[PDB]
Amino acid sequence: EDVMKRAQGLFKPIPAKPPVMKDNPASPSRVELGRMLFFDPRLSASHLISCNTCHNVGLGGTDILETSGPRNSPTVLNAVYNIAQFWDGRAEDLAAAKGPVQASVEMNNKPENLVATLKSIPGYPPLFRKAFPGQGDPVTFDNVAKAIEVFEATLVTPDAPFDKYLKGNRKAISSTAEQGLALFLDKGCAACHSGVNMGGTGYFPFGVREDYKVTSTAADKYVFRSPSLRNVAITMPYFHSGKVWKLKDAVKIMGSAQLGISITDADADKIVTFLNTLTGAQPKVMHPVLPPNSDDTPRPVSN
Amino acid sequence: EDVMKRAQGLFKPIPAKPPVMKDNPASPSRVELGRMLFFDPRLSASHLISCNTCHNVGLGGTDILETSGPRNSPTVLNAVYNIAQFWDGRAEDLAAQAKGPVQASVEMNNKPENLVATLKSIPGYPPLFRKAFPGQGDPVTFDNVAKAIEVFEATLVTPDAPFDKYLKGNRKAISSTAEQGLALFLDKGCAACHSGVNMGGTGYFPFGVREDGRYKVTSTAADKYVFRSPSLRNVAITMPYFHSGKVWKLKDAVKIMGSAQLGISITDADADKIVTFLNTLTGAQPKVMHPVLPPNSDDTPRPVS
Ligand code: HEC
Ligand code: HEC
Ligand code: HEC
Ligand code: HEC
Ligand SMILES: [Ca+2]
Ligand SMILES: [Ca+2]
Numbered sequence: 242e243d244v245m246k247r248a249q250g251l252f253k254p255i256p257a258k259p260p261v262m263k264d265n266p267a268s269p270s271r272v273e274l275g276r277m278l279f280f281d282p283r284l285s286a287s288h289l290i291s292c293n294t295c296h297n298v299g300l301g302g303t304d305i306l307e308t309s310g311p312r313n314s315p316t317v318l319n320a321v322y323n324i325a326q327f328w329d330g331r332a333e334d335l336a337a338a339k340g341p342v343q344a345s346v347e348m349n350n351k352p353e354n355l356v357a358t359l360k361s362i363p364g365y366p367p368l369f370r371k372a373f374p375g376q377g378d379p380v381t382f383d384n385v386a387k388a389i390e391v392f393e394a395t396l397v398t399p400d401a402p403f404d405k406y407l408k409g410n411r412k413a414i415s416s417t418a419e420q421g422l423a424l425f426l427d428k429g430c431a432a433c434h435s436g437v438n439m440g441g442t443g444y445f446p447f448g449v450r451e452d453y454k455v456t457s458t459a460a461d462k463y464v465f466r467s468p469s470l471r472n473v474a475i476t477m478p479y480f481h482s483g484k485v486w487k488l489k490d491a492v493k494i495m496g497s498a499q500l501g502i503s504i505t506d507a508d509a510d511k512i513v514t515f516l517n518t519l520t521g522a523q524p525k526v527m528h529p530v531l532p533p534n535s536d537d538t539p540r541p542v543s544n
Numbered sequence: 545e546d547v548m549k550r551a552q553g554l555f556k557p558i559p560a561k562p563p564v565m566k567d568n569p570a571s572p573s574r575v576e577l578g579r580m581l582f583f584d585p586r587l588s589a590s591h592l593i594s595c596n597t598c599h600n601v602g603l604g605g606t607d608i609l610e611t612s613g614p615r616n617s618p619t620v621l622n623a624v625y626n627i628a629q630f631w632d633g634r635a636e637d638l639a640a641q642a643k644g645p646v647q648a649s650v651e652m653n654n655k656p657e658n659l660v661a662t663l664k665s666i667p668g669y670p671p672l673f674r675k676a677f678p679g680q681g682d683p684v685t686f687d688n689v690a691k692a693i694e695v696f697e698a699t700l701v702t703p704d705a706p707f708d709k710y711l712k713g714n715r716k717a718i719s720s721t722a723e724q725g726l727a728l729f730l731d732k733g734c735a736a737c738h739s740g741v742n743m744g745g746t747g748y749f750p751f752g753v754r755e756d757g758r759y760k761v762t763s764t765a766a767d768k769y770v771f772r773s774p775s776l777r778n779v780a781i782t783m784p785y786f787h788s789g790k791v792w793k794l795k796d797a798v799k800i801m802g803s804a805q806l807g808i809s810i811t812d813a814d815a816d817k818i819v820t821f822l823n824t825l826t827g828a829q830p831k832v833m834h835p836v837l838p839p840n841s842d843d844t845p846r847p848v849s
Contacts, residue, residue: 249764249766250750250764250766250805251750251764252750253750253766253768260636261636262636262640263637263640263642264640264641264642265640321636321639322635322636322639323635323639324628324635324638324639324747324748324770325627325747326639331741332625332626332627332740332741332742332745332746333563333564333565333624333625334566335627336624336625336626336627336629337565337566337568337624337694338566338567427807429733429736429807432733432736432737432749432806433736433747435749435750435770436635436748436749436750436770437635437768438635441635442635442747442748442749442770443627443628443746443747443748443749443773444627444740444746444747445736445739445740445746445747446553446554446555446556446739446740457553458553459552459553460552460553460556460711461556462556462741464627464739464740464746467747499553500736501733
């Protein structure tokens with residue numbers, strides 16, 4: 242199959258094994274701690290919002306809201322395979338500081354309040370000494386993000402029917418889905434939505450905006466990340482703004498004159514059918530049991 | 545006309561003003577320190593090699609050699625507008641920081657702590673680090689060396705290429721043949737990968753040119769490597785081409801990029817028009833004063849060989 246072979250050139254399947262992070266080695270106790278932090282709403286100043294609120298592991302790693310400039314929450318699933326870390330920005334700033342964990346935390350908290358709160362919870366410091374042995378002061382923000390990152394690295398979705406197809410089985414997806422794939426290649430979609438994550442590799446001067454929703458940029462210095470399409474069927478709504486609710490409308494907008502690509506409604510349906518093959522196996526995550534406040538834990542602040 | 549409006553969609557001209565670096569504010573003394581360090585060969589263990597050796601401001605910010613796995617040196621000119629920092633790697637690793645390009649370059653020829661100890665042994669350096677990073681007890685550090693350099697790098701931009709005058713409205717700034725090259729570049733789909741203010745350097749793609757004058761071809765990286773699609777600004781003057789530097793002639797690099805593997809075929813006539821367009825992307829080359837560097841003391845480490 243030409244189509245299969247062309248697919249195997251542009252994409253690779255998600256490995257079952259969590260990828261190693263260089264300079265952040267995974268260990269049981271570090272992965273455990275990262276899981277606790279991920280579900281602990283005390284990392285928000287109000288004590289109500291955890292990472293799981295906006296990146297819900299039960300809803301495709303996102304929260305099925307438009308936004309929470311406001312942005313749609315991208316999935317945490319397979320985010321460890323994204324090269325491009327942010328929805329949009331100017332070239333120079335995406336080039337030259339804060340990564341996504343820190344940025345996310347600052348949405349509803351201050352790093353220093355976060356760390357002072359963790360220190361006030363007697364169960365946390367012993368877990369940080371186990372997870373970061375050797376350090377005199379292991380409860381720090383950088384260590385919070387390290388622990389969370391080794392947990393996020395286990396939030397991968399191997400075994401999507403498309404991945405079975407990449408590994409050699411032509412029958413793992415329906416031939417309607419195969420027609421959508423063929424269309425996805427020939428129309429040019431794959432140039433931007435490529436590699437092991439089927440996107441997340443780069444930025445383009447191409448946002449979807451209003452004035453109806455259309456692809457555009459005026460000569461404007463902002464560029465947008467072309468997202469991974471993995472699990473796109475269950476991470477609605479779509480695009481940086483979350484303004485477009487249906488996958489089919491998303492596919493149709495992407496059939497813009499501005500990126501080459503003309504597509505019929507019939508083409509769209511086949512493409513959607515193909516995009517439906519990219520839903521992998523969803524991680525089964527245990528809700529952690531969190532250590533209790535002390536009398537000295539800071540009070541919630543409503544915002 | 546229409547070809548113009550499409551080009552204004554995809555590309556953006558280089559600003560004349562150095563871009564502001566988040567958390568790395570430019571100041572006259574930080575810029576001056578960064579220029580000194582850039583031209584100081586004592587940042588290498590041999591004391592012979594400076595940033596300017598591999599990224600020569602005289603030669604389009606590169607060194608016109610294949611390689612110095614070994615990689616061709618990308619230009620420093622406008623590098624402040626590259627989002628993608630490296631030639632290639634796996635997705636998960638490019639996602640992480642194994643250090644940025646300054647640290648990694650230094651590691652080609654030296655160790656960071658030897659660099660720092662060398663700078664402290666040069667009496668004229670510590671005071672300049674004090675002026676450049678006020679309020680810090682110990683300002684001579686590896687991170688401060690990179691910060692000083694980066695604000696110096698931020699001045700190494702090339703505004704006013706003929707193509708940028710065209711972006712700004714003037715259709716006569718490039719030849720009508722250049723304009724046909726432009727039309728081709730867009731229509732064959734080149735611009736999706738070589739877009740924005742830097743006309744590339746925005747992303748990684750699972751295509752590298754490999755050993756197959758067409759011994760070289762685009763081939764997929766079903767191993768798990770992706771390659772940066774580079775900025776094509778000043779491409780006419782930063783030969784040889786591709787991550788390995790193996791293709792010397794621009795026109796050959798263009799033909800190679802006419803790959804069916806990327807849904808593209810171009811005639812030889814086509815290639816020539818595209819080359820003509822690419823030649824419009826050379827900007828004004830920065831005029832950089834070679835610094836006068838402070839002298840060793842008697843305790844400055846010896847060169848190694
Ligand atoms: C708890 C501390 C966490 C963790 C570990 C992460 N998040 Fe969020 N997140 C939110 C939004 C709107 C974005 C998009 C920001 C933008 O691009 O402009 C993010 C982004 C991320 C990422 C990047 C994922 C990727 O595509 O590579 C990651 C890894 C990440 N977050 C992890 C929104 C929120 C919230 C809504 C209020 C909350 C709460 C969090 N995030 C918290 C966390
Ligand atoms: C071929 C016609 C396609 C198809 C079927 C899709 N794409 Fe793209 N894509 C690009 C960018 C920069 C974005 C983000 C835009 C924004 O957020 O404002 C997108 C977004 C999508 C989505 C939304 C998915 C989500 O998780 O929100 C979908 C379903 C989608 N694309 C499918 C970039 C590009 C390109 C770069 C030039 C090209 C070509 C395409 N996309 C083409 C297509
Ligand atoms: C002196 C300290 C410097 C500075 C400030 C920089 N360089 Fe180099 N450089 C070299 C090579 C082969 C590469 C490519 C590496 C790869 O991607 O695999 C680099 C890369 C850079 C960059 C990134 C540029 C970009 O495209 O965005 C930058 C900003 C950079 N360098 C700055 C080769 C060498 C050398 C050859 C021996 C020497 C000496 C240096 N570099 C030194 C420095
Ligand atoms: C349309 C026909 C074109 C033209 C005229 C060019 N490109 Fe690309 N390009 C891409 C990548 C990933 C690379 C680096 C590959 C490697 O080094 O192994 C390139 C490289 C080039 C160059 C060399 C520039 C240099 O400084 O060395 C040139 C002149 C060039 N390209 C022109 C990526 C892509 C794409 C991604 C899918 C597409 C499409 C194109 N390029 C198309 C074209
Ligand atoms: Ca979404
Ligand atoms: Ca070169």
